[PDB]
Amino acid sequence: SKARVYADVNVLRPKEYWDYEALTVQWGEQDDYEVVRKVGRGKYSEVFEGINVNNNEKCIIKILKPVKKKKIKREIKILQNLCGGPNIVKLLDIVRDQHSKTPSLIFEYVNNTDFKVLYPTLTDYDIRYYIYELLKALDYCHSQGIMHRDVKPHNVMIDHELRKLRLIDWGLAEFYHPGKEYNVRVASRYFKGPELLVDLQDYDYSLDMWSLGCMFAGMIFRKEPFFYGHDNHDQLVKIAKVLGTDGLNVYLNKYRIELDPQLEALVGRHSRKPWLKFMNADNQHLVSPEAIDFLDKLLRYDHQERLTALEAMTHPYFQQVRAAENS
Numbered sequence: 001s002k003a004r005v006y007a008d009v010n011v012l013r014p015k016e017y018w019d020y021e022a023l024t025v026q027w028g029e030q031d032d033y034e035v036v037r038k039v040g041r042g043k044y045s046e047v048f049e050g051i052n053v054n055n056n057e058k059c060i061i062k063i064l065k066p067v068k069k070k071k072i073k074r075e076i077k078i079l080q081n082l083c084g085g086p087n088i089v090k091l092l093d094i095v096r097d098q099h100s101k102t103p104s105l106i107f108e109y110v111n112n113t114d115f116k117v118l119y120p121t122l123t124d125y126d127i128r129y130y131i132y133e134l135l136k137a138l139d140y141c142h143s144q145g146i147m148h149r150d151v152k153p154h155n156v157m158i159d160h161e162l163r164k165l166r167l168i169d170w171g172l173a174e175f176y177h178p179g180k181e182y183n184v185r186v187a188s189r190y191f192k193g194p195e196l197l198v199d200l201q202d203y204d205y206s207l208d209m210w211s212l213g214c215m216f217a218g219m220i221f222r223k224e225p226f227f228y229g230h231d232n233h234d235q236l237v238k239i240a241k242v243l244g245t246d247g248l249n250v251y252l253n254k255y256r257i258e259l260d261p262q263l264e265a266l267v268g269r270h271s272r273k274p275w276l277k278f279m280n281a282d283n284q285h286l287v288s289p290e291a292i293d294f295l296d297k298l299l300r301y302d303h304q305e306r307l308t309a310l311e312a313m314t315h316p317y318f319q320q321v322r323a324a325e326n327s
């Protein structure tokens, strides 16, 4: 399996672009930034609201609990490579304690409203608008040879007053190299693509499109999380009860995958459930034939069949958003 789009990006670019293990950092002034309060909490990180003590502007400060040098370098190099791209969080500085050398990444501040509060207030047009903004970010990182691998509402900062969206938390992100077999312990359970759940290791940018689909379904139907599995095995079961097992069996056969017999028995046999069965009186103002058709073109077992971020942006569901972005 190889990516349909952007497959050879990292071949064409200089080795220094993607060879993050070779990164040297030019460390900024640690004293320029102070930590004000915790916005919590990592496993390696803690994140804080901070202040730039020069201009008094707010920032966000992520202190990287000490840390495999390799993953720190990966995150920094990716952030540097993407800085300036549309709707990508901006890494403003990189500093560290002169003695313990504890690094802190310094980000632009976004006045976020948590999705559990914000999403219930969004209109039909608001969802269209923000999903389009998110697709800009994904097409950009993909075009730059990078997979995000942790798309979810928790990683999408929105300042609703400012109509401003940023994709954050690039700590799971990776460079795409054709035929490379990646770690499947990526993304959050409810957002894991079928490829991760069946251990198809040579996945690509299209993983982010499945995740985006899960998020989208949650938003338009108000069923969050949309695929609500109790463990990684049950996650595949929940997906199967909706898309149906016919498509799952064809997918497994195509990529020459055989499920562990235990997981096969758990999945069972199911018919496809039509998307309209999720519509109800509470969510019907967010649901349209174009929303359903867009959803349907993202949530495919076969990662090769999913819309690319670029293709997604051409979907009729976005027609009014594109119309306003006009002179």
Ligand SMILES: Brc1c(Br)c(Br)c2[nH]cnc2c1Br
Pocket (backbone or CB within 6 Å): 039, 047, 060, 062, 089, 107, 108, 109, 110, 111, 112, 157, 168, 169
């Ligand atoms: Br506003 C914000 C930002 Br900008 C980042 Br980078 C972040 N990382 C973890 N949490 C956050 C927040 Br809440």
